[PDB]
Amino acid sequence: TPAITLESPDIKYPLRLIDREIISHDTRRFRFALPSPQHILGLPVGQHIYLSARIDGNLVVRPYTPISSDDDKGFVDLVIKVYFKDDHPKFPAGGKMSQYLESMQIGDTIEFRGPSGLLVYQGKGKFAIRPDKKSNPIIRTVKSVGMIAGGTGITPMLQVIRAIMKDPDDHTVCHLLFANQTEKDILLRPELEELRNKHSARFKLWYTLDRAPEAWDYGQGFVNEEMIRDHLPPPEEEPLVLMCGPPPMIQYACLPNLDHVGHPTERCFVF
Numbered sequence: 172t173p174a175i176t177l178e179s180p181d182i183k184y185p186l187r188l189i190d191r192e193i194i195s196h197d198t199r200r201f202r203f204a205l206p207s208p209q210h211i212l213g214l215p216v217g218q219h220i221y222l223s224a225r226i227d228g229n230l231v232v233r234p235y236t237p238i239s240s241d242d243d244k245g246f247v248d249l250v251i252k253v254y255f256k257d258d259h260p261k262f263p264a265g266g267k268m269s270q271y272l273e274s275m276q277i278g279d280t281i282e283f284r285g286p287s288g289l290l291v292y293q294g295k296g297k298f299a300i301r302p303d304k305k306s307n308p309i310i311r312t313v314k315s316v317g318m319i320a321g322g323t324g325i326t327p328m329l330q331v332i333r334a335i336m337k338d339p340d341d342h343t344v345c346h347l348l349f350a351n352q353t354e355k356d357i358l359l360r361p362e363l364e365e366l367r368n369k370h371s372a373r374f375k376l377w378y379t380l381d382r383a384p385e386a387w388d389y390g391q392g393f394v395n396e397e398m399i400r401d402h403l404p405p406p407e408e409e410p411l412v413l414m415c416g417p418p419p420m421i422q423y424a425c426l427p428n429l430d431h432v433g434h435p436t437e438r439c440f441v442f
C-alpha cells in the first residue's frame with residue numbers, strides 16, 4: 172500500500188516539473204515528480220486534479236485528468252493542449268493555464284490539488300455519482316458506457332477506458348465518440364487506436380470532425396442524433412453516458428440529442 176500524494180483535498184501540493192515532451196506543434200506531455208519515487212498520486216478513477224497558479228495577478232485554476240494512473244510510482248503525466256497567443260483571431264491572448272505550463276522551466280513547481288469530481292468509477296460497471304459535493308454518492312452498475320469527448324475532453328475518458336481495459340474481469344463495454352475540429356486536433360489517436368486493436372470487444376471507437384478531410388471514413392459535422400444512435404449504446408441497455416468537451420458541444424450538440432434519442436438525464440454525466 173504505497174504512499175499517497177494528495178492526502179487531503181484542501182492542501183495544494185507543489186510538484187516539480189521533471190520532463191517535457193513535444194507531441195505536436197500545440198500538444199505536449201508534462202511529467203512532474205511526486206514527493207518520492209515510491210509515491211503514487213492518489214486519484215480515484217473518474218476524478219481529476221486542479222492546477223492553480225497566480226498569473227498576471229489573478230488566481231487561475233483549471234482541472235486536468237492525468238494520463239498516468241495510481242499504478243505509476245514517482246511521477247504524474249499530464250497531456251496538455253497549448254492555446255498560444257497571437258494565433259486565433261478571436262482569442263488573441265491565448266490560454267492562461269496552458270501557456271503557463273508551456274513556459275515552465277524544468278525544476279519549476281506548480282500546485283496540484285485533488286482528488287476532485289462527482290463521479291468515481293468503482294470498477295466492473297459500478298459508478299458512484301454524487302449529485303453535489305455534499306450529497307452522498309448514488310451507485311449505478313451498468314453493462315455499457317457511452318462516451319462523448321471533444322478536444323482535451325478525451326483524458327477523462329481515457330482514464331476510465333484504461334481502467335476497464337486492464338481488468339480482465341471487467342466486461343463493461345465502452346462506446347467512444349470523439350469530436351474535434353480537424354484531423355490534426357485528434358489527441359491521443361495512436362493510443363486510442365491501439366486500444367481498438369487490442370480490446371475491440373469492449374471498446375468501440377468512432378470520430379467526427381467539424382471540417383473533415385477528403386479521405387475520411389468517419390463522421391463529418393457536429394455530434395448529432397444519428398451518431399449518438401449509431402456509435403453509442405442504445406438507451407434500452409440503460410447505459411451511462413459520459414461527456415467532456417467544450418461547453419458549446421455539451422449544450423448544443425450532446426444534451427439535446429441525447430434527450431431526443433432517449434437517454435435519461437440521470438444516466439448522463441458531464442465531466
Ligand SMILES: Cc1cc2nc3c(=O)[nH]c(=O)nc-3n(C[C@H](O)[C@H](O)[C@H](O)COP(=O)(O)OP(=O)(O)OC[C@H]3O[C@@H](n4cnc5c(N)ncnc54)[C@H](O)[C@@H]3O)c2cc1C
Nearest residue numbers: 234235236251252254255259262265266267268269323326
Ligand atoms: C475534467 C476535465 C479534464 C481536463 N483534462 C485536460 C487535460 O488532460 N489536458 C488539457 O490540456 N486540458 C484538459 N482540460 C481542459 C482544461 O481544464 C482547460 O480548459 C484548458 O487547459 C484551457 O485552459 P487555459 O487556462 O489554458 O485557457 P483559458 O484561458 O481558460 O481559455 C481557453 C479557451 O479560450 C479559447 N482559446 C484561447 N486561445 C485559443 C486559441 N489559440 N485557439 C482557439 N481557442 C483558443 C478557447 O475557447 C479555449 O477553450 C480538462 C477539463 C476538464 C473539465
